[PDB]
A and B are shown apart, each in its own frame.
Chain A
Amino acid sequence: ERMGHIELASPTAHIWFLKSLPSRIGLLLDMPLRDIERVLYFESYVVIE
């Protein structure tokens, strides 16, 4: 009945709310899923502001 927690250094993305189509992150940010996957795979930078 007792859970623990791991304190992740870099905050990672949930795979359910990213890969279960429709992706909900591409549907919220209005970005293509391939471009979001390129950002998450550390292949290409994205600009915030």
Chain B
Amino acid sequence: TPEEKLLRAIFGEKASDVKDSSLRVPNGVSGTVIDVQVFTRDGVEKDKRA
């Protein structure tokens, strides 16, 4: 909210990134990555890898 916007300019942020759901390899599977294809949606800003 704009109340929290002015107080954000006062104080700052928090972490708020506790739960981690990163993609991991299933057990037993190995081998070299050969292709990474990053599709996105029209509207979301991309990153350096994209």
In the complex, A touching B, CB below 8 Å? no
